[PDB]
Design an enzyme around this catalytic site. Structure first.
Site, PDB file in Angstrom:
ATOM      1  N   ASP A   1     -14.326   8.733   8.648  1.00 13.69           N
ATOM      2  CA  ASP A   1     -13.954   8.648   7.240  1.00 13.69           C
ATOM      3  C   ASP A   1     -14.065   7.252   6.641  1.00 13.69           C
ATOM      4  O   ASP A   1     -13.256   6.877   5.798  1.00 13.69           O
ATOM      5  CB  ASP A   1     -12.553   9.222   7.000  1.00 13.69           C
ATOM      6  CG  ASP A   1     -12.271   9.488   5.516  1.00 13.69           C
ATOM      7  OD1 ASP A   1     -13.229   9.776   4.752  1.00 13.69           O
ATOM      8  OD2 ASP A   1     -11.087   9.411   5.109  1.00 13.69           O
TER       9      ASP A   1
ATOM     10  N   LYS B   1       3.193  -0.079   8.841  1.00  9.41           N
ATOM     11  CA  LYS B   1       2.915   1.267   8.356  1.00  9.41           C
ATOM     12  C   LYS B   1       4.053   2.199   8.724  1.00  9.41           C
ATOM     13  O   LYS B   1       4.380   2.383   9.887  1.00  9.41           O
ATOM     14  CB  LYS B   1       1.600   1.787   8.904  1.00  9.41           C
ATOM     15  CG  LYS B   1       1.025   2.960   8.143  1.00  9.41           C
ATOM     16  CD  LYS B   1      -0.352   3.270   8.688  1.00  9.41           C
ATOM     17  CE  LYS B   1      -0.937   4.465   7.993  1.00  9.41           C
ATOM     18  NZ  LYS B   1      -2.311   4.669   8.479  1.00  9.41           N
TER      19      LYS B   1
ATOM     20  N   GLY C   1       0.825  -1.191   0.000  1.00 12.01           N
ATOM     21  CA  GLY C   1       0.000   0.000   0.000  1.00 12.01           C
ATOM     22  C   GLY C   1       0.860   1.242   0.000  1.00 12.01           C
ATOM     23  O   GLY C   1       1.837   1.322   0.742  1.00 12.01           O
TER      24      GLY C   1
ATOM     25  N   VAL D   1       2.763   1.243   3.327  1.00  9.80           N
ATOM     26  CA  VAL D   1       2.565   0.022   4.099  1.00  9.80           C
ATOM     27  C   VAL D   1       3.290  -1.137   3.449  1.00  9.80           C
ATOM     28  O   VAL D   1       3.141  -1.386   2.256  1.00  9.80           O
ATOM     29  CB  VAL D   1       1.105  -0.372   4.206  1.00  9.80           C
ATOM     30  CG1 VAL D   1       0.993  -1.671   5.000  1.00  9.80           C
ATOM     31  CG2 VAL D   1       0.283   0.751   4.840  1.00  9.80           C
TER      32      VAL D   1
END
Ligand code: 24R
EC number: 2.7.11.1
Length: 305
Positions: free
Chosen positions: A129, A36, A14, A21
């Protein structure tokens, strides 16, 4: 062998603008984990506030369907959050592959999602979110909610109506709205509100009329109506929604209740000893678990599960 702590980095899984990530291997256990990596040198104030809020949240959540935190590594320049890896990937991906979920399968997933978000709410946490990328899958196709650090293509279609009317945009009620959208997408494989532009989108959301897919059950649609209420102060709580008929079809002796977190085992004689033989002190193992330090000692402890 390792790149950072006890972790051999393997593969970027990611990329955000301010965070990467990586998939990685714990070395002492050889388990796969998500790392992360946040470059703090690039971050402005709001970013930094957002980040420290994330660390706060992660240290606290202990749910079967939210990605679990194993360790925090802090240096001046860079922060690392080591967490659980969900090998199934994004629920978005799954939908594109096999089209809409049959209500049975959607329900299995949605009971998980609702459980997790209501757990957060219990701890006075709202995500604020929730969008597609937040929903991941483990290897057994369990939901894993991911990323409490906000890291504009995804956002708009999940935004509650308040955003577009100037009203405050905090409170668990925000999440409740997003859960409706998510639900709609699982059973329809598409969004309730989209536009070719921002105004289009905003008009459709302020109207709150989604269109009912002909194949959809009336039970599902009554559930939708409980989430997608225009008036923020008139939307239900997830605790109330949990009692919903559609939520509980096929669990007629297993209604959905708020998550009860199981009591901590920071004293497993099995794992403890294995770490004393591995070179740790017992006072340091216990102090790390009870101080909930998320240090290198704690990571090893949890990863031996
Ligand atoms: C097969 N497959 C498995 C995966 C995949 C992708 N991401 C993850 C994560 C994860 C933890 S925090 C986080 C995050 O904050 N991402 C942010 C940074 C990266 C961009 C999106 C942001 N939401 C992602 C955990 N397991 N996992 C598995 C993907 N494909």
């Amino acid at each position: 062998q390792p790149h950072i702590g006890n972790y051999r980095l393997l593969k970027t899984i990611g990329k955000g603008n301010f965070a990467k990530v990586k998939l990685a291997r714990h070395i002492l256990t050889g388990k796969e984990v998500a790392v992360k990596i946040i470059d703090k040198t690039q971050l402005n104030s709001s970013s930094l506030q957002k980040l420290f809020r994330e660390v706060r949240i992660m240290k606290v959540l202990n749910h079967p369907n939210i990605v679990k935190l194993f360790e925090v590594i802090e240096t001046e320049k860079t922060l690392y959050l080591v967490m659980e890896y969900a090998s199934g990937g994004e629920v978005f991906d799954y939908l594109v592959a096999h089209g809409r979920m049959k209500e049975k399968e959607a329900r299995a997933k949605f009971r998980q999602i609702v459980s997790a978000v209501q757990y957060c709410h219990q701890k006075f946490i709202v995500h604020r979110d929730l969008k597609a990328e937040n929903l991941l899958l483990d290897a057994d196709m369990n939901i894993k909610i991911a990323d409490f650090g906000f890291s504009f293509c995804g956002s708009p279609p999940y935004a509650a109506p308040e955003l577009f009317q100037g009203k405050k945009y905090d409170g668990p009620e925000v999440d409740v709205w997003s859960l409706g959208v998510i639900l709609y997408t699982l059973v329809s494989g598409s969004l309730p509100f989209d536009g070719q532009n921002l105004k289009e989108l905003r008009e459709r959301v302020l109207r709150g009329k989604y269109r009912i897919p002909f194949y959809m059950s009336t039970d599902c649609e009554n559930l939708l109506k409980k989430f997608l209420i225009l008036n923020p102060s008139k939307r239900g709580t997830l605790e109330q929604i949990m009692k919903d008929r559609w939520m509980n079809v096929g669990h007629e002796d297993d209604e959905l209740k708020p998550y009860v977190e199981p009591l901590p085992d920071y004293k497993d004689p099995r794992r403890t000893e294995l770490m004393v033989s591995m070179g740790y002190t017992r006072e340091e193992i216990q102090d790390s678990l009870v101080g909930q330090r998320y240090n290198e000692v704690m990571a090893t402890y949890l990863l031996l599960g």
